[PDB]
Design a binder for these strands. Sequence first.
RNA 1: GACAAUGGUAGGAGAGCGUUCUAAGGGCGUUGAAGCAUGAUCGUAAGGACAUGUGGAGCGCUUAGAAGUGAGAAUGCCGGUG
RNA 2: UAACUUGGGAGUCAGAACAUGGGUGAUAAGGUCCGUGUUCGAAAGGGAAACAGCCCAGACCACCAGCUAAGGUCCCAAAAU
RNA 3: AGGACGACAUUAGACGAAUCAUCUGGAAAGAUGAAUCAAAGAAGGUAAUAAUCCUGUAGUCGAAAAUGUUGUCUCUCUUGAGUGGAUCCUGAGUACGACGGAGCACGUGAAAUUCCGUCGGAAUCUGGGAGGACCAUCUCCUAAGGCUAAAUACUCUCUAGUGACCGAUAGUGAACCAGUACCGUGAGGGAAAGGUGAAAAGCACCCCGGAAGGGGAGUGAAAUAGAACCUGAAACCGUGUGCUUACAAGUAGUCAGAGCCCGUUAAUGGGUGAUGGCGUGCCUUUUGUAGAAUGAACCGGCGAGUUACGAUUUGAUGCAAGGUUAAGCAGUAAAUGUGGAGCCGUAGCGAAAGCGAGUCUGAAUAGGGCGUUUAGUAUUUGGUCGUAGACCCGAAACCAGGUGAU
Lengths: 204, 116, 64, 145
Amino acid sequence: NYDVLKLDGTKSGSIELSDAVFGIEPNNSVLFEAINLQRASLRQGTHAVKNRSAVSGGGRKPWKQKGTGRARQGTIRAPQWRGGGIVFGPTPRSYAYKMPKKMRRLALRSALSFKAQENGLTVVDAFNFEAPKTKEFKNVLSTLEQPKKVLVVTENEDVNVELSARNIPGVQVTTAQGLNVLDITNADSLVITEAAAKKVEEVL
Amino acid sequence: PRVKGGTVTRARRKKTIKLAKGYFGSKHTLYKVAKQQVMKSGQYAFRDRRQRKRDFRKLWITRINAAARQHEMSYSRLMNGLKKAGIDINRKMLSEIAISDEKAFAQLVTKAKDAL
Amino acid sequence: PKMKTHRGAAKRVKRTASGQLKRSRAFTSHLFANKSTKQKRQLRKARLVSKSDMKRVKQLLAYK
Amino acid sequence: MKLHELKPAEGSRKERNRVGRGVATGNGKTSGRGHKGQKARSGGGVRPGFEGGQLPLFRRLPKRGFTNINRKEYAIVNLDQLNKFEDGTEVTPALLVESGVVKNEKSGIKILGNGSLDKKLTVKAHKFSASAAEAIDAKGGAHEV
RNA sequence: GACAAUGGUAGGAGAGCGUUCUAAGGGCGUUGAAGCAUGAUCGUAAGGACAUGUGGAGCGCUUAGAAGUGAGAAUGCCGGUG
RNA sequence: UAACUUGGGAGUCAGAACAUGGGUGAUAAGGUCCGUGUUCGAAAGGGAAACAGCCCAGACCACCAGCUAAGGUCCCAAAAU
RNA sequence: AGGACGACAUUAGACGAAUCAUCUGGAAAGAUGAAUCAAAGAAGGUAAUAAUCCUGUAGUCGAAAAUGUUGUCUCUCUUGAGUGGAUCCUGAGUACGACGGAGCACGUGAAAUUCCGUCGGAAUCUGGGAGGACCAUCUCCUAAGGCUAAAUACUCUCUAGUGACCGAUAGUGAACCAGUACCGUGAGGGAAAGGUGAAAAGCACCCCGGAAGGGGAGUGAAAUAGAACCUGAAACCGUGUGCUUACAAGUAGUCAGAGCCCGUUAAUGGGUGAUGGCGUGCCUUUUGUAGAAUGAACCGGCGAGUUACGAUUUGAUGCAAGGUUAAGCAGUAAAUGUGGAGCCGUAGCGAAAGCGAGUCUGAAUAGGGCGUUUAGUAUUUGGUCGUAGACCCGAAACCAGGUGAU
Ligand SMILES: [Mg+2]
Ligand SMILES: [Mg+2]
Ligand SMILES: [Mg+2]
Ligand SMILES: [Mg+2]
Ligand SMILES: [Mg+2]
Ligand SMILES: [Mg+2]
Ligand SMILES: [Mg+2]
Ligand SMILES: [Mg+2]
Ligand SMILES: [Mg+2]
Ligand SMILES: [Mg+2]
Ligand SMILES: [Mg+2]
Ligand SMILES: [Mg+2]
Ligand SMILES: [Mg+2]
Ligand SMILES: [Mg+2]
Ligand SMILES: [Mg+2]
Ligand SMILES: [Mg+2]
Ligand SMILES: [Mg+2]
Ligand SMILES: [Mg+2]
Ligand SMILES: [Mg+2]
Ligand SMILES: [Mg+2]
Ligand SMILES: [Mg+2]
Ligand SMILES: [Mg+2]
Ligand SMILES: [Mg+2]
Ligand SMILES: [Mg+2]
Ligand SMILES: [Mg+2]
Ligand SMILES: [Mg+2]
Ligand SMILES: [Mg+2]
Ligand SMILES: [Mg+2]
Ligand SMILES: [Mg+2]
Ligand SMILES: [Mg+2]
Ligand SMILES: [Mg+2]
Ligand SMILES: [Mg+2]
Ligand SMILES: [Mg+2]
Ligand SMILES: [Mg+2]
Ligand SMILES: [Mg+2]
Ligand SMILES: [Mg+2]
Ligand SMILES: [Mg+2]
Ligand SMILES: [Mg+2]
Ligand SMILES: [Mg+2]
Ligand SMILES: [Mg+2]
Ligand SMILES: [Mg+2]
Ligand SMILES: [Mg+2]
Ligand SMILES: [Mg+2]
Ligand SMILES: [Mg+2]
Ligand SMILES: [Mg+2]
């Protein structure tokens, strides 16, 4: 059982949230794998170098194999040469990988349960924003007594909430479907509407 | 990402060179020959910590021999007599006594002779 | 790319329940006048690929 | 967990070993290859199964058999697996697939006699072992191909 | 507390040092960052501090992640200078 | 106080002297080929003037402590003129 | 083939919120204090690090003219079905065959299916082709004429962006007047080389000198930033000096040690070293190297087991008689949702038909082989292997197309 507050901070009511979603013992191994996986998936991987084939020129043998007194050499673009080709080095590639779906769901539930146990979970009756107003959203956060880093969860895309929170440092807005381990874990507190909480509970 | 050679190389070589302070010419100046010499220095120092114990026992024995001969006794018989007398003073101490107070050493010599 | 099965070995073995490789027997092609009745009778019986050979060849049959 | 306090599961991670980075590693210089020969060379080493010119095993041994173009193989179900359906159930290939007893039907469902049947069922399958049919009948049930 | 082991080439195994970058947290900096230089400093090693001079704007630290991650030798390549 | 089984990873396939049982050679070779042991290889320390392979002996680190091994004790040079 | 009107977009642009004070300092954006905007806290600049100083950003607005994509009118073109089975038509040097080649994953093979050269060469709906030689039956098609968007490939280019990509020996060969200089008859080969300062305020004037160069003075926070002018390591070259050295045999140190000179991260200190003991560099390669075997003049920088996809094993984790999705679609180039086709496992044995906790062999209920009498599977760290140049450098050569008889 969790309190449901109004934007002014008073108790609108109470809500029941399944402990199978918000009440599990977080699985830190799975949560770590999920965080690492998401961070890897964000990488662009656009990095490259020119190996000895790729560097310009270098076709001919710089000097005859024997007789000159110099080390034998086969191309001015060999790797030990200044300006030569790079041995191995970066080559474009993806870093993304997968984990089983059950583990994805377990990771999300573990992050949400960690918030619930750390008392960084606040349930609000609704966001009744008709026009975007960053100042009003800042006041709402202060009245709810929120920390610097807040993840705001709506049931569906809420344009005015998104636009009002967008410019506040440390405030991220998402939907119930858009929840992810990195965002939840980065946040210090979660502010979720009752409808969004019910949707999350259904999904997980 | 690329990791350029950076500063570590110079720091490490400079340490070896500083260890080579006082060596002759290039050996206090050039990393390669300083490194070699510092390697030799370490090996020599390891060996000589052990050789030093031998050398100092040798010195003590020589001095004890001289003192015993001044009392008409060889080192060998003096040590045997001290053993039979049950006196456990080691060679370093015997030498220092013989140097520093001759009357005490003469008393030790008489103990040895009586035991023999 | 995918590793390739060694097709000759695949034509010459079969994998058993415990993962061993059943094999047939050499000296069973011709010149039977030069091998005793007992020799031929017993060469009729299949064997397994030895442990020492398996160390060498196992990757050739990974998909088998 | 916090992003500034991440910790992988114990024993899940190990640092890769890097060769050719000095003698103290124990893999400096020759980088674990020993000295010389074919196996010390970039790209060196013989084909797997090569035996240095001794006739290889898979040439000294002969080929055997053929593959049947019309080969049939059946998805098998044992009686112990049938034991999950309520007595009186009409077990069919569709029910087996839906219940998840059979995943791939292959050439059809064959019932085999491993384990003990503890329920009365009407079993429809493409084939039955003699023992499987006998057990299904003896438990009071029926079977049909 | 006891008492047992600890030479080592190829090679196997383990634990670590340091480099660049990233994430998060927490810091430093024109009242002087990095770099460089010197010193009689500390750690079992790789190595880590501190002070002073130079320098003039950037840089540590913690945990995790990722690698163009460590050179004394290749009649190595380029530069400088004997 | 080991041994064996299974599985992951190897390197090695130029060996040397010495002693001894033998072939070969000439009861030649620091020769050559086998058997057996040790040492070197991969082993520092003490002795054999110097001297991988001989003799003593296997260095975790420190000591300006003691007892010994081979080998030594007139001086070089520790210890018996 | 056109025409009229309209819409949208591209090719310039316009508006666009909100900060002051003190301290340090050459300078404030820094620190301190107190405020303010935010649908704008992207970013760059400004005398150091700025949401509120500038350029901008979110948001909103804008086109005389040209171009592009589109909608509606116009314009243009244009019949559409059924019944009958008498006759007619339905692609010929074609299909096909033989021989010789080629192409099919398929190397001539039992070789279908498909093309080329040479020679031969059909049938006509009761026809013809195909189902991997071939025949029959059945089934599916209807060759020897043509056209056809999209889903797919690629990037010289333009616009807007992105990066656990480089940061001047790197990154393009080229950050710079570089395919330049230079080399070659020619094809062709092919560099080196970035940094004053915030502002040029870029040193008036005096002095030595022919000049170069310098000493002052001045500018500047700094000239010790004065022109390849941020920093300024090492090799190397000099000047001064504390200790030391002209009877001594030296891999240059090490251990012992007086004398002399100092005085530190203040530690049972630092520099030097009369004299004694001990002691033939390093790497490579070797049975064995002080080796008179190899390599390195010195210093600096650069310079060698990587990544992708498969395999296997180990560790980790989730689920478990189950485990797991691929492409695709949605999403922010994300996590993720969805997607069960597919894959592995739950049963083996046999060459196979097949039988099945058994099966194969066997005449055998014998004996024997492989099995049964639970655990897998997905992702991933590590190790190793395979395919790739596969740890790095090095041939003599081979082939192809060009350039040369100055
Ligand atoms: Mg030369
Ligand atoms: Mg390059
Ligand atoms: Mg960098
Ligand atoms: Mg380097
Ligand atoms: Mg036969
Ligand atoms: Mg390691
Ligand atoms: Mg080793
Ligand atoms: Mg080396
Ligand atoms: Mg190895
Ligand atoms: Mg080598
Ligand atoms: Mg060899
Ligand atoms: Mg080898
Ligand atoms: Mg042969
Ligand atoms: Mg050891
Ligand atoms: Mg020992
Ligand atoms: Mg290892
Ligand atoms: Mg490197
Ligand atoms: Mg010999
Ligand atoms: Mg020989
Ligand atoms: Mg022998
Ligand atoms: Mg020895
Ligand atoms: Mg000696
Ligand atoms: Mg004694
Ligand atoms: Mg003497
Ligand atoms: Mg404006
Ligand atoms: Mg403005
Ligand atoms: Mg101000
Ligand atoms: Mg033909
Ligand atoms: Mg046909
Ligand atoms: Mg045909
Ligand atoms: Mg057929
Ligand atoms: Mg098309
Ligand atoms: Mg530079
Ligand atoms: Mg360049
Ligand atoms: Mg260049
Ligand atoms: Mg400069
Ligand atoms: Mg003199
Ligand atoms: Mg060797
Ligand atoms: Mg030799
Ligand atoms: Mg010489
Ligand atoms: Mg050589
Ligand atoms: Mg040389
Ligand atoms: Mg060099
Ligand atoms: Mg490889
Ligand atoms: Mg002419």
